[PDB]
Amino acid sequence: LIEVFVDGQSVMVEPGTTVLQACEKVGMQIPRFCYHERLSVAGNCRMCLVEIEKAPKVVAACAMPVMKGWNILTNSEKTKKAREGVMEFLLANHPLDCPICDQGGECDLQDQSMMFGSDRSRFLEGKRAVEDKNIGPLVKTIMTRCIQCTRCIRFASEIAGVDDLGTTGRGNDMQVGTYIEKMFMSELSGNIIDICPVGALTXXXXXXXXXXXXXXXXXXXXXXXXXXXXXXXXXXXXXXXXXXXXXXXXXXXXXX
Amino acid sequence: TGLVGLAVCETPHERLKILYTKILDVLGHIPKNAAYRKYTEQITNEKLSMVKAEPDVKKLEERLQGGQIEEVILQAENELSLARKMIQWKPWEPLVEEPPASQWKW
Amino acid sequence: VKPIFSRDMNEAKRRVRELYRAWYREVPNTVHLFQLDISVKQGRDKVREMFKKNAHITDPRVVDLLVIKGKMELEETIKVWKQRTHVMRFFHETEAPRPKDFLSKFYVGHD
Amino acid sequence: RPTVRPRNDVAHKQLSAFGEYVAEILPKYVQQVQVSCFNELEICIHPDGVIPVLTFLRDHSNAQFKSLADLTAVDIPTRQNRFEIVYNLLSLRFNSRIRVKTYTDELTPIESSVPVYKAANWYEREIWDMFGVFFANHPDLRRILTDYGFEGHPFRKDFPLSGYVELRYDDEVKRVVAEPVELAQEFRKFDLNSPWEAFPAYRQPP
Amino acid sequence: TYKYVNLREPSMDMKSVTDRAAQTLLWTELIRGLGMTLSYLFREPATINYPFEKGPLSPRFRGEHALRRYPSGEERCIACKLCEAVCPAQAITIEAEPRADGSRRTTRYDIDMTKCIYCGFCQEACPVDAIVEGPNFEFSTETHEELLYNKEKLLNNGDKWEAEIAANIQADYLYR
Amino acid sequence: XXXXXXXXXXXXXXXXXXXXXXXXXXXXXXXXXXXXXXXXXXXXXXXXXXXXXXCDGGGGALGHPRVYINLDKETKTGTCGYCGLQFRQ
Amino acid sequence: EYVVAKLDDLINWARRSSLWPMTFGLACCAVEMMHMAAPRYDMDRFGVVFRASPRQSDVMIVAGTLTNKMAPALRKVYDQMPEPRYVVSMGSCANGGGYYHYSYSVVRGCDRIVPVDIYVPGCPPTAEALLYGILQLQKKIKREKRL
Ligand SMILES: NC(=O)c1ccc[n+]([C@@H]2O[C@H](COP(=O)([O-])OP(=O)(O)OC[C@H]3O[C@@H](n4cnc5c(N)ncnc54)[C@H](OP(=O)(O)O)[C@@H]3O)[C@@H](O)[C@H]2O)c1
Ligand code: SF4
Ligand code: SF4
Ligand code: SF4
Numbered sequence A: 001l002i003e004v005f006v007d008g009q010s011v012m013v014e015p016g017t018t019v020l021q022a023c024e025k026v027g028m029q030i031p032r033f034c035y036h037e038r039l040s041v042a043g044n045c046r047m048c049l050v051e052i053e054k055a056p057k058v059v060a061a062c063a064m065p066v067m068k069g070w071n072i073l074t075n076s077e078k079t080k081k082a083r084e085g086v087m088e089f090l091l092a093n094h095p096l097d098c099p100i101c102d103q104g105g106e107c108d109l110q111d112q113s114m115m116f117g118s119d120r121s122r123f124l125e126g127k128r129a130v131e132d133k134n135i136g137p138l139v140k141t142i143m144t145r146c147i148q149c150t151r152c153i154r155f156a157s158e159i160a161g162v163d164d165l166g167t168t169g170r171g172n173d174m175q176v177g178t179y180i181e182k183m184f185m186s187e188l189s190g191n192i193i194d195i196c197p198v199g200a201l202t203x204x205x206x207x208x209x210x211x212x213x214x215x216x217x218x219x220x221x222x223x224x225x226x227x228x229x230x231x232x233x234x235x236x237x238x239x240x241x242x243x244x245x246x247x248x249x250x251x252x253x254x255x256x
Numbered sequence B: 001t002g003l004v005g006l007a008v009c010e011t012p013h014e015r016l017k018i019l020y021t022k023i024l025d026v027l028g029h030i031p032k033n034a035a036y037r038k039y040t041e042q043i044t045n046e047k048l049s050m051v052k053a054e055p056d057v058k059k060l061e062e063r064l065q066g067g068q069i070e071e072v073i074l075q076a077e078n079e080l081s082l083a084r085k086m087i088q089w090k091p092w093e094p095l096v097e098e099p100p101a102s103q104w105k106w
Numbered sequence C: 001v002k003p004i005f006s007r008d009m010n011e012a013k014r015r016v017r018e019l020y021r022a023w024y025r026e027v028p029n030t031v032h033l034f035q036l037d038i039s040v041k042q043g044r045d046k047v048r049e050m051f052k053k054n055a056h057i058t059d060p061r062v063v064d065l066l067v068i069k070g071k072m073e074l075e076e077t078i079k080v081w082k083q084r085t086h087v088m089r090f091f092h093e094t095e096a097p098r099p100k101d102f103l104s105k106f107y108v109g110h111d
Numbered sequence D: 001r002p003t004v005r006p007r008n009d010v011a012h013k014q015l016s017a018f019g020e021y022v023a024e025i026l027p028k029y030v031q032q033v034q035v036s037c038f039n040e041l042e043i044c045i046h047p048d049g050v051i052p053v054l055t056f057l058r059d060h061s062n063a064q065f066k067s068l069a070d071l072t073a074v075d076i077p078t079r080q081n082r083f084e085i086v087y088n089l090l091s092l093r094f095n096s097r098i099r100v101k102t103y104t105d106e107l108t109p110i111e112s113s114v115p116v117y118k119a120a121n122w123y124e125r126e127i128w129d130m131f132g133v134f135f136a137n138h139p140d141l142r143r144i145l146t147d148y149g150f151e152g153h154p155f156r157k158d159f160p161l162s163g164y165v166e167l168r169y170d171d172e173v174k175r176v177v178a179e180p181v182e183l184a185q186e187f188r189k190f191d192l193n194s195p196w197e198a199f200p201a202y203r204q205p206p
Numbered sequence E: 001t002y003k004y005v006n007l008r009e010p011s012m013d014m015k016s017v018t019d020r021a022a023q024t025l026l027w028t029e030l031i032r033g034l035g036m037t038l039s040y041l042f043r044e045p046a047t048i049n050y051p052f053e054k055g056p057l058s059p060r061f062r063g064e065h066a067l068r069r070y071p072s073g074e075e076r077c078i079a080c081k082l083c084e085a086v087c088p089a090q091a092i093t094i095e096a097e098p099r100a101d102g103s104r105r106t107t108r109y110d111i112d113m114t115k116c117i118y119c120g121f122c123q124e125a126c127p128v129d130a131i132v133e134g135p136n137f138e139f140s141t142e143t144h145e146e147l148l149y150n151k152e153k154l155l156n157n158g159d160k161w162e163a164e165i166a167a168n169i170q171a172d173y174l175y176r
Numbered sequence F: 001x002x003x004x005x006x007x008x009x010x011x012x013x014x015x016x017x018x019x020x021x022x023x024x025x026x027x028x029x030x031x032x033x034x035x036x037x038x039x040x041x042x043x044x045x046x047x048x049x050x051x052x053x054x055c056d057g058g059g060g061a062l063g064h065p066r067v068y069i070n071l072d073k074e075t076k077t078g079t080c081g082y083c084g085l086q087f088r089q
Numbered sequence G: 001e002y003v004v005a006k007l008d009d010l011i012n013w014a015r016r017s018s019l020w021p022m023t024f025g026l027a028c029c030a031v032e033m034m035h036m037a038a039p040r041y042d043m044d045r046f047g048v049v050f051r052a053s054p055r056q057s058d059v060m061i062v063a064g065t066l067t068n069k070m071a072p073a074l075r076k077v078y079d080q081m082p083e084p085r086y087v088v089s090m091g092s093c094a095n096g097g098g099y100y101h102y103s104y105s106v107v108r109g110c111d112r113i114v115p116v117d118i119y120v121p122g123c124p125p126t127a128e129a130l131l132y133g134i135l136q137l138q139k140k141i142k143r144e145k146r147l
């Protein structure tokens, strides 16, 4: 065990621990896009870029471990310069769907712009649009709304089993789709719509029905299939329509 | 001549000097180690010297009042009542009461 | 000794009694001066059922707070204020459901 | 900063001297916690003695506030002690604003401000109506912002916004207006709460 | 700054006392006050009779709610629940289902006139500019049921006011 | 389309053999003209040259935020979020 | 036959001619109700004369928010009115609370206390729109007594 200070305050952590994983113990959450709960640690966004006490270049929270007793500030001037800047890169090639978009409030990228993103102005000219990907019953996927990350790519190979999603191009023309026209298998791939931060993958049954506002959440155990328990069901006046997986320590691994 | 308030500005000098000399004696009965006596005295002694220096000019009224002598007299008239109430209810000299539950952040 | 409230545990019982006497004399006075409404005999029974619901007695703080609250809702006719026959009527008149039966309430479908 | 900052702090150093001046008296009976932020001063006071604190700030030579104009009360169930009576004070000769607070649960009676201030009694009636905080040695505690036959207190966070008795029909009775009907139109409970803390330094350690 | 309301006695001696006494003995200044409304009777009244003449207004004005549509058909409202959240009265209700195939625009759309304080908030919050407030005045009903607006329909029947709306919105883009 | 009762507008049933609806009898029920999206497909589809084209209702004056639509699928119609306007090539 | 049918319209012509309002100083709606007396938009001897007293007047205009403290007060005023009486609930508060509605004190829509014939929806009830509240009232009076 080795102690390392985060925002001057010292906190105890393991020898092999991530910077974002250690910051949570000190009650501080950094801006995230690539998960830390169950999905494998990967770069491919550089949003969680934080500056150390003595460093020429900023390091990512997911990649770089603590190792030695070094101070890292979360509310620093160098950390703010990155977070206000990277948001502008994410929205330079964003299709603009916020009213029409299936998510609205639930969207993680929507919230991060209000808290960390640069509000004053946005300079952009001509955003690239991607063709619609083939999907069967659950989760009507829009490739344009996707930010091109690595979250659902690793989810298909590790958590779901059979791989389907991957890289298709090189530049801005690169898509997160299956490339070959084939419907995704059920098993546990229904949780992929709840996995994605942006409004790219969202359930076809709950598409354009209710927003994040007005819908009241209530926790209830699942009746269909044993062992599965704790799932938030949105009321949204009289008849329920949206169902979401609630976090559990041992009952369910962040998937319904 | 007429004052701004309901209390009429009566032509009386040294009247303000009586009330300020009265309150100094009241303070030296119970509290001596307490800061209430030590801090109030230095304001009164500085104010009393200004009355002695100025011979019935409007500049004496302009010294930390600027609403004639009648408005300053009202502060001196209620000064004896507050000094007697501070001596009656023990708070300035004694400090031993309980503290509230640790919570403040909203 | 915090907090005082008004009286001790045993003294609080006789404070309600003192309030009861003043309000027991007002039910004949709230008919002739105000309005006919119902009845003098039925009005007195409406007083007794109000105190039976409040009857618990465990803390002097709870009992004494009911006295001050009682010295406003029952003081509404002491110094004679306007109620306009809509206020002061504690018992429901247009409300007729009193079902306490697993068999009775379930037939109406509730909860 | 051109549009970023509202005003620069310059009188804040002089206002901080007030927070030391009252604290130099040092009573456990009065002082407790002194907080000063954004050109203002806040003091919270022990429940046992509120009247001696109200006689202070009034009349005093160094600090002549006198006018105890505005009187508020906070409804919060997070603490062990529920309600919090907040006095807002203003000086006319000195030209400054100071705040006086209470910390007790105040379901049990609290000291009144009627002997100190003449208009405070009307504000004291507002607190007893909305919250249910009794003032000891208060002259005439009449109801203002409540109905003549109203049960409970209409502002408390423990009970709903619509109220228990609220709907008033004329119905079958010739003159008597009804009360017992309780159903109203649906107020949409917004379950919105944004992820990520908006502000640094406000975060508290568990 | 001090303006002072007190005159400190205008009368002093002989000439200043007698003229101040003359106005209190008889009238004079009351006859002067009588002549003030005499000239007011002579000048023309600024009065507008409603069934024929109409009063002054503005290019941006809010009355009864009406939702707009695109030049080549189609509902301009996209269904967000945005205007629902801004609404301080919560008079506007919105529930959405997919329209046959492709487009996803509205099913339930009620704006209650039992509430609504007329903010222009829903006119401003709308990204597609569906609810555009027209210069409406005439609304009078027998019952509450006739007063509150149904699922679009009557709100869609704002076509009789949409011709004025198109002229008013020309003053709205690049604001005033 | 109408069957026995009043005409349906934007997919709304009146009543099954008249049970619930009774108030709309003395007063005539409202109906919106061309509410079944008949005017949506009435507008002719525009031809494009570029791979992606930005959509607008009528410039910055009329309410339409800019959305880019990709026309490369060939089999798909290609329509924006706000409009039912279709684009080919 | 024809004289009887025209005599009923002659009695109804008196209500078409003039109706005296009640000065219900209930809220902000009452300020625009004072604008009916204001020259620019006038009903002053066009068909409206302000005089107050519920016993003399023909039409009562509920001008704003009503509470549970006001529900017994307004009810008997309507009862103090002569039997040919008309109630015009003007404003969103008069129609079911401006905001409120889901509040504890405010009675919803006036119709729970006193029945309403003509509704005016306007919060700040524009004097232009207010003029219908008296003109439509006169138009609604069509036929009384057949037999
Ligand atoms: N005396 C009692 O209290 C008593 C005792 C025993 C039984 N009952 C029973 O209880 C009932 C009490 O009712 P009620 O007498 O109180 O009613 P009511 O006052 O006579 O009212 C009946 C209404 O219906 C209308 N109406 C009736 N017949 C009509 C016709 N042929 N043409 C047009 N309009 C007509 C009338 O309108 P217009 O005025 O516009 O014509 C009237 O307003 C009676 O039916 C009786 O059988 C009463
Ligand atoms: S993905 Fe999020 S930010 Fe982007 S349009 Fe959809 S809701 Fe808005
Ligand atoms: S669909 Fe969502 S999870 Fe998958 S790559 Fe795109 S943004 Fe990431
Ligand atoms: S009126 Fe505008 S903001 Fe409201 S749901 Fe329709 S498109 Fe969205």
Ligand code: SF4
Pocket (backbone or CB within 6 Å): E083, E086, E087, E088, E089, E090, E091, E092, E111, E115, E116, E117, E118, E119, E120, E121, E122, E123
């Ligand atoms: S004008 Fe205001 S109160 Fe009326 S519908 Fe729009 S947002 Fe709601």
Ligand code: SF4
Pocket (backbone or CB within 6 Å): E117, G027, G028, G029, G030, G063, G064, G065, G090, G091, G092, G093, G094, G098, G122, G123, G124, G125
């Ligand atoms: S409807 Fe509007 S103007 Fe009229 S009383 Fe209510 S808030 Fe005031």
Ligand code: FES
Pocket (backbone or CB within 6 Å): A031, A032, A033, A034, A035, A042, A043, A044, A045, A046, A047, A048, A060, A061, A062, A063
């Ligand atoms: S959130 Fe750390 S690399 Fe994406």
Ligand SMILES: [Zn+2]
Pocket (backbone or CB within 6 Å): F055, F056, F057, F064, F080, F081, F082, F083, F085
């Ligand atoms: Zn478009």
